[PDB]
Design a protein around this ligand. Structure first.
Ligand code: HEM
Length: 153
């Protein structure tokens, strides 16, 4: 797992997310869908959308982006002791949404990109490596629950 100082860097940048959770959520999702169009096909509510202007205008997209980052913030704040938070998340993503582990890798890279773009002075080289480890931890633990739930992610 991560050191105390690695967790400190992760939570320090996360604090900058809290002042505008929705605005961050929209930027993350738009980065994900533009970099990896196949990922948008998983979102039945808005898989019909084609352009970034449409994505920015979508209220459904902004609300989903808010749920995603709020749930990730909850997990991160647990500093690895997140088994209770991770449980419902694994369950829904292996049954209802069927989200391959590869797509969770794509969104991790999107979050790291957005954080670097909006808060570089709270997200230098070492804080980036710390957030990279925290998100690997997250994916690894979800993949372990996928197996049990019978989803080869
Ligand atoms: C940081 C990683 C992620 C976190 C914390 C996260 C969390 C959530 C949360 C909290 C919800 C709402 C409640 C639920 O259904 O469990 C949700 C919904 C959803 N997520 Fe995930 N998610 C992540 C990644 C992804 C990825 C990478 C995809 C697809 C590429 C995805 C597809 C979906 C879909 C299709 C829904 C339902 C959307 C709707 O209601 O319109 N998620 N996610």
């Amino acid at each position: 797992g991560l050191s105390d100082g690695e967790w400190q860097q992760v939570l320090n940048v996360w604090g900058k997310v809290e002042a505008d959770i929705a605005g961050h959520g929209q930027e993350v999702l738009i980065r994900l869908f533009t970099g990896h169009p196949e990922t948008l096909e998983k979102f039945d509510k808005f898989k019909h959308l084609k352009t970034e202007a449409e994505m920015k205008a979508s209220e459904d997209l902004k609300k989903v982006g808010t749920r995603v980052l709020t749930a990730l913030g909850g997990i991160l704040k647990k500093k690895g002791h997140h088994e209770a938070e991770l449980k419902p998340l694994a369950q829904s993503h292996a049954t209802k949404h069927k989200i391959p582990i590869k797509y969770l890798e794509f969104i991790s890279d999107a979050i790291i990109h957005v954080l670097h773009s909006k808060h570089p002075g709270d997200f230098g080289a070492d804080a980036q490596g710390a957030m990279t480890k925290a998100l690997e931890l997250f994916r690894n633990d979800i993949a372990a629950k996928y197996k049990e739930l019978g989803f080869q992610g």
